[PDB]
Design a protein around this ligand. Structure first.
Ligand SMILES: Cc1cc2nc3c(=O)[nH]c(=O)nc-3n(C[C@H](O)[C@H](O)[C@H](O)COP(=O)(O)O)c2cc1C
Ligand SMILES: Cc1cc2nc3c(=O)[nH]c(=O)nc-3n(C[C@H](O)[C@H](O)[C@H](O)COP(=O)(O)O)c2cc1C
Ligand SMILES: Cc1cc2nc3c(=O)[nH]c(=O)nc-3n(C[C@H](O)[C@H](O)[C@H](O)COP(=O)(O)O)c2cc1C
Ligand SMILES: Cc1cc2nc3c(=O)[nH]c(=O)nc-3n(C[C@H](O)[C@H](O)[C@H](O)COP(=O)(O)O)c2cc1C
Lengths: 337, 337, 337, 337
């Protein structure tokens, strides 16, 4: 069979295929309370009906002021557990595994009131200057990721992913372009990584399941982070028990990025090879042929699909056809698939 | 602008495009109570997110023993109103109009216990022989369609379609092959049409909105009904205020049917021309080009899509692309569509 | 088997499928002598390798001043026979049948010097006013079509098509908008049809094989010709022994034409039904599904494909795949098809 | 613009895009004299009309007994020059550059009479045992490649490619599995490479244009050649002035090969990186997205397309559409592309 449709086991979780619905913000929590809405349910569950092996729920803030927008999903409150519990139950009932992306927007939070970051440096010209987190505020945030993970476990998620990419809080700490701290959380690569190190260790105190970490493998900026730096971080994450690194890139600051089909795959293959860590490839992957090639040539272990799943919720079926192979259809659509 | 994406107003309902999700049974009411489940919600709402102009909910039984299977949706009880109320609200919120198909499986009901029909004639050698409805029972069934329509109105549906096709109860009364009654509901075309006539008149006492009727325009059998018969019924339906005839075919009895792309279009075109009645074309229509041709050549007014919407929930986008035109995308997917 | 890939026999010619490469001018006779060039050979033969059932060569002038442009193909001289003989042999060798479209551009000829027409009326404000053909000149032109047909037979063509459409010479005689003659070739429909009648009768004196006539089934203009007129001409053509009417439309004069997929199909269906004449459907037919529908619903006998064959020379294979059926591939490409 | 459609210059040859028609035997020289036929002309020229940047003509034997089959093209005689001269002229006239693959089947020659190889070892159970080439016979063959190159230059080819792959003669000398010689052409890697070294040096005495070499980057067999060996050969070829290595694989002997989209790309990228040599990627590349990714991620410099160009001669257009970009169409098809 095609590798794209061959199961893979990570910890005590077996995925029926290697297609992953990349986390994508829907800005649909209209009550601004971080809760799920009917749209979210239809949005996610339809891709489970569509046979996506693993569905990763969009960035969910671990702190209200850590949201990107006031319409973001949240997991900073026990009040969020009930809705997520229904979502995981329904997604899994359709045959897919489900994960959640724990996040904090840091200096990129588009909210009124003080926003936070490792250093008081604004994202750009049109952004507010963030407040430099006190050492204790940083430690409180670590606890919030821990608390959020505990809620995710209770809600029934199969996988937890830490959002350490796209110029958000953790990414801000990792990069010297945004982290000018002179305390235990700044300076050396080890210190810049400390925030993430503590988040991983604390999350593991309440979560023993598959743990993913999404990173921006490059800042595409002089004096910023590059793949070499991330290969280093990957080795440390492996030692800590991280199961897979979801390889994205950019967004820490404005930069020129050459975008094209599979433009971030090199990051996934280099980390996989040099850090001996399973990786997720993402970035303009839109057809089954590319997906199969990435897996067969050992460039990544899972294929994250974003925008193509917005155009085609049933990408799994489309990819199967493109690869001239057969996959099980949801029972209700046996007469059409 | 392409005709497929041109609005049409029926009564007080304006459809934003001519794409209709054909009613398709999902056999997913696992509690065997005819109620909706999370699967149904995601299944239908996803096509609304997908911009389908009109979504018609699958055959919903007006009487429990009128179900095709014990996992069919139902609308025989006021308890069914709550679920449907949530569904219509959520579908309309995405920007689509919604309808429901009122039905009764007649002799094709796959349930334990007596099943009913106009005459005690089994569908085939593998089916149970139905019980001939008493005149009283027939009139009670008319009232159940009326009562069901009332529930549909309360639930917020935009359109109601009467299922008078696919060999089910109403179709059984219409055809001489299945109706050998010696009372007012059998014999001449007037008598054979009487059941449907009374259903339409009664439904109109509680529902003044768009009213569709799906028929099997031919039995493809000697001594059975053919397009000439249905043109006759269509003229009577027009006088009664039916707004559109959804043109399907067959299934009253086993028959040899030449299936091919647009194989039922001739029925929609003839009824449209000869009965001066708006029609819905359905049957192996899988792309925007065929849909546009059918509309532009005046063969039908609405394009019903069945299986292609099971393969591609976002057929509307796919069709827009095939026709080299643009249509509004759901706000949440503007970065992908 | 799909009707699109079902054989059909016209006279003594059996076509292996119903796909026809519509005649399309290539304006590539760079020596301005109407002779074939390597481009023409590869252009046509590639579609034969592509399994097209019948390839009709572009408009070939029966008189040099009857060319549309000075780079048109010609068949006004015996010197044109050698090239055509090689082309028909090579096309047939690949397994396809081949035809040629005999033509005369009339007032739409874009050449230096006097151009001719039934009446001195220019095509539009940008065109030169043609010279009214003397009765002698008209009869000489009839002989040139006859002589051209003789050359086509000698060159080995399987089918000959008379170009009586797109506002060219013959079409000009047929329509009241362009024909104001006061002799035997103008006035009543009998007189306006006379030019074509004589061409058909004379051609038949030297050619007994399949004979096609392409017409513009409507002028889309007040006081111009419409489908009713062409149904009348079609009945006369049937009596004369014409085997099939290739149904196109317009171009006699500028007009508002609603173009859409299958916009000329109604013409092919009406002529087929009312004149009991085999017809070729053409006009925005781009996929196997539409082609199959047209054939199965009895709207035409052959499917003429134009621009789609310019985008996809191997449309036959593409259509077979779309129809989920199999067709023989050229032996040399068995490892790819 | 897309890299796939950006020109690239090699020596004094500029390709308009980076799509290459991979050499593919057509077994169509029916007279068994190695000459071109009308089919060959239509076959190749149609892809030039189709905008393929570089068309590489199928394996052409440098010696009659070096043909794979008696229906192969040849270039062992001056009698072959005339036909090739017409072919290059016509392909270039349509806008493409053209190359020819100089070949010798060695022990895989399916011809009657003695066949040759470095050692008397048969390809398999159903193959004849080849005659071990005397040192002089090897030197004569080197001269034949030289002579063939001289003919190719006279015929007007833009590129010459040496076929050192697919288990044929040169490949046989390169691999220790098939080369057991104990003279100057066997033993060490240097000696096994000597035959190719001499062919390259001699060809360069009569040809100063772009020179490609196709290799089988792996024998997929224990004790056979692997990518490490070919990276070594690549460095030697670079020193000799070879411009690009066309990276295929296998066929020396029967072996288990895992085939999938882009299954030979790793060979192209490793040789490109470690030998600092331009490379051509080939092997189940069927869409523009994969092609663009290969080029943008620096895995190869040219994209060789084989079977997809047999299914779609106009792959260039299809790929352009897939990449949402525009490319010039042949003037004759401007109204369709
Ligand atoms: C509407 C939208 C919302 C997104 N939200 C998130 C998010 O919450 N978390 C994240 O890590 N990436 C997010 N992304 C980035 C995507 O997950 C994905 O990595 C990116 O689009 C590259 O992949 P693609 O080409 O398959 O879409 C978003 C992208 C889009 C288009
Ligand atoms: C799984 C399935 C369930 C269906 N259930 C219904 C139904 O409840 N009512 C109805 O009128 N037609 C029903 N149909 C018939 C379809 O609505 C449609 O008319 C038929 O599939 C022809 O169209 P298509 O070729 O676009 O699928 C069903 C079809 C399928 C495949
Ligand atoms: C470049 C080009 C040249 C054409 N030349 C001719 C011609 O010589 N004779 C003719 O009858 N139609 C000619 N046509 C009209 C086509 O045969 C065909 O009827 C028309 O394109 C409608 O079909 P299509 O939508 O499949 O392309 C031409 C069309 C194109 C695009
Ligand atoms: C019919 C056919 C003939 C071929 N002949 C040759 C040849 O003469 N020389 C060569 O180097 N490769 C030859 N090949 C191998 C192809 O060039 C190509 O490298 C292979 O098919 C892998 O690519 P693809 O997946 O794009 O077809 C041939 C392949 C096919 C299907």
């Amino acid at each position: 069979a095609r590798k794209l449709f061959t199961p893979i086991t990570i910890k005590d979780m077996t995925l029926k295929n290697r297609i992953v619905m990349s986390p994508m913000c829907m800005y649909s929590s209209h009550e601004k309370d971080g809760k799920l809405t009917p749209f979210h349910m239809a949005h996610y569950i339809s891709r489970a009906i569509g046979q996506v092996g693993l569905i990763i729920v969009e960035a969910s803030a671990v702190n209200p002021q850590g949201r990107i927008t006031d319409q973001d999903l949240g997991i900073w409150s026990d009040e969020h557990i009930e809705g997520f519990a229904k979502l995981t139950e329904q997604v899994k009932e359709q045959g897919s595994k489900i994960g959640i992306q724990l996040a904090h927007a840091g200096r990129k939070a588009e909210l009124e009131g003080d926003i936070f970051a490792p250093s008081a440096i604004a994202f750009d010209e049109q952004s507010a200057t963030p407040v430099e987190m006190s050492a204790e505020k940083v430690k409180e945030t670590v606890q919030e990721f821990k608390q959020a993970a505990a809620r995710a476990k209770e809600a029934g998620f199969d996988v937890i992913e830490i959002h350490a990419a796209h110029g958000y809080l953790i990414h801000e700490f990792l990069s010297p372009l945004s982290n000018h701290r002179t305390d235990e959380y700044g300076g050396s690569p080890e210190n810049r990584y400390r925030f993430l190190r503590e988040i991983i260790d604390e999350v593991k105190q309440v979560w023993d399941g598959p743990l993913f970490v999404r990173v921006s493998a490059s800042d595409y900026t002089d004096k910023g982070l590059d793949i070499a730096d991330h290969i280093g971080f990957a080795k440390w994450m492996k030692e800590q028990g991280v199961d897979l690194i979801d390889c994205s890139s950019g967004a820490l600051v404005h930069a020129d990025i050459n975008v094209f089909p599979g433009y971030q795959v090199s990051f996934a293959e280099k980390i996989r090879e040099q850090a001996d860590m399973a990786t997720g490839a993402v970035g303009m992957i839109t057809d089954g042929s590319m997906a199969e090639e990435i897996l067969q040539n050992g460039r990544a272990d899972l294929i994250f699909i974003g925008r193509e799943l917005l155009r085609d919720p049933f990408f799994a079926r489309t990819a199967a056809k493109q690869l001239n192979t057969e996959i099980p259809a949801p029972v209700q659509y046996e007469r059409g698939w």
